[PDB]
C-alpha cells in the first residue's frame, strides 16, 4: 500500500490527499512532529531524511512500490496519470500546466507572508484582488479551469483559494464565478464525502512556527 | 504571425527556452523591453504593453503563436516539449522529468535569490553547492540525459541551470564527472552548436541590470 509522507499540515500536501480521497485511493499516511519553540526540533524526520531512497529527500514524499517520489507537483502529476485527471487535449494542457506554475507562485508568496512576514500581511492582502480577477478571468464560465473537464490543477486551485479564505474571508467575494468554483469542488460527492469523514484535516494549514499558525491557530 | 517570445534581454530562466528553439530550428522573433538605469531601474515600455498582449497571467517570459499565447517559463517549455517529441514517454521517465522539473525550479530560484539580492552570502551559497550536485550527479548516474536514454525538455533545463552556476563558481562541477560530461554533450549536439556560433546566441548577461552579481561581475 502506498505511503504519503508529510507535517501534520495542509499547506502544498493538501491538495493530493484531495486527489486520494476523491480516487478511493487507500493510503498511508506518515507524518513527522516538530518540536516546540525555540528550536523546532526535527531530528525524526532528520533521523530518516536520507534513509528513504528518495533521489532528492524532501516533504511530502510519495512511496507507491518501487516508485519513490518528492516534490509536490511530481506527485501530483503521477497520480494525475494514474486517476484520469490529467488534461487530455492540447488545449487543455497548455491551460493545465499555465495554471499549475502560476498557483504554485501564488502559494509560495502566501507561504512567504505566512510564516516570516506576517507583518507585511495588510499588504499581501491588498494586492489579492488583481491576482483572482486573473484566475476569475482564466476560469469565465467554465466549471473547471481547463473547460469541461476536471483535472489535478482544480485540486490545487481549490486548496489554495480556500487556504486564502482563511488568511483573508473576504477575498473571493468580488468573483462570483471562483465562489461558484469553490462550491462546485466541495459539492463533487466523492469530494464532500472525504471532507466529512475522520481522516481529513482542516487544521493546521501552516507548520507550528508560522507566525500566521501562532496568531490565528488556523 | 509566427511566434513571439517575450523577455528581457537576458539568459535568467527564458535561455532553457532558446535553447529548445534552436535545437529545434524554429523561426521566432525574440522581443525585448529594456530596463532603465539607477536608481530607478525604469520598465515604462514593458509596463506598457504588459496588460495588452491578451495574455491570462502577463509576465515574462511569454509565447506567442497564433492564437495561443503562453505564459510560465516550464509551461512553455512543456508546450514546446510536446511540439517537438521532447516529453518522456515511459511511466519510469515521466516520473524522472517531472521531479527533476520541480528540484531545478527550486535551485534556480535559490540561485536567483542569492544573485540578485543576497550576493554577499555568495560564499555560502557555493560551499552548499556540492550537497545538492551529489543528488543531482547520483539521481543521472551512467545515463547520457537526466530522463534516460532520451533527451527531453528537462535537459534544456539542467544544463543552462548548471552553466549559470558555472559562471558563479568556476569549480562547482569538478567533483562530478558525470556532470561535466553532460554539459559537453549536450554543447556537442549540432543543432546545440551552431546555435551557439550564431550572432543571435545570448552569452551575457545571465542576470538583469540590477541584480547584484550583475553590477559586479559583469557577466
Ligand atoms: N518544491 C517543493 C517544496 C517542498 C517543501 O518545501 N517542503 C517543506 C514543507 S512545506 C519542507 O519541510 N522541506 C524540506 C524538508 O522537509 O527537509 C515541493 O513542492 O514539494
Ligand atoms: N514562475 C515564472 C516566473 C516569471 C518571472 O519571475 N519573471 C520575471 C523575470 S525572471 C519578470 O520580470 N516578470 C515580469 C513582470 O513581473 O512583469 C516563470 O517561470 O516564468
Not at 49 to 69: E, H, M, R
Not at 176 to 202: C, G, H, T, V
Request: glycine share 6%.
Amino acid at each position: 500500500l502506498p505511503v504519503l509522507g508529510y507535517w501534520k499540515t495542509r499547506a502544498l500536501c493538501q491538495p493530493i490527499r484531495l486527489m486520494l480521497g476523491y480516487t478511493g485511493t487507500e493510503f498511508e499516511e506518515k507524518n513527522y512532529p516538530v518540536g516546540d519553540a525555540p528550536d523546532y526540533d526535527k531530528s525524526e524526520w532528520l533521523a530518516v531524511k536520507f534513509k528513504l531512497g528518495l533521489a532528492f529527500p524532501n516533504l511530502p514524499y510519495y512511496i507507491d512500490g518501487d516508485v519513490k517520489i518528492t516534490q509536490s507537483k511530481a506527485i501530483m502529476r503521477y497520480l494525475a496519470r494514474k486517476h484520469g485527471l490529467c488534461g487530455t487535449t492540447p488545449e487543455e494542457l497548455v491551460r493545465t500546466d499555465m495554471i499549475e506554475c502560476q498557483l504554485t507562485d501564488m502559494h509560495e508568496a502566501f507561504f512567504t507572508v505566512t510564516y516570516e512576514h506576517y507583518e507585511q500581511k495588510d499588504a499581501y492582502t491588498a494586492s489579492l484582488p488583481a491576482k483572482l480577477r486573473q484566475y476569475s478571468d482564466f476560469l469565465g464560465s467554465r466549471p473547471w479551469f481547463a473547460g469541461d473537464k476536471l483535472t489535478y490543477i482544480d485540486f490545487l486551485a481549490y486548496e489554495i483559494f480556500d487556504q486564502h479564505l482563511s488568511l483573508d474571508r473576504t477575498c473571493l467575494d468580488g468573483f462570483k464565478n471562483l465562489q461558484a468554483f469553490q462550491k462546485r469542488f466541495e459539492d463533487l460527492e466523492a469530494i464532500k464525502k472525504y471532507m466529512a469523514s475522520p481522516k481529513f484535516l482542516k487544521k493546521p494549514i501552516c507548520n507550528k512556527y508560522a507566525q500566521f499558525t501562532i496568531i490565528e491557530g488556523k
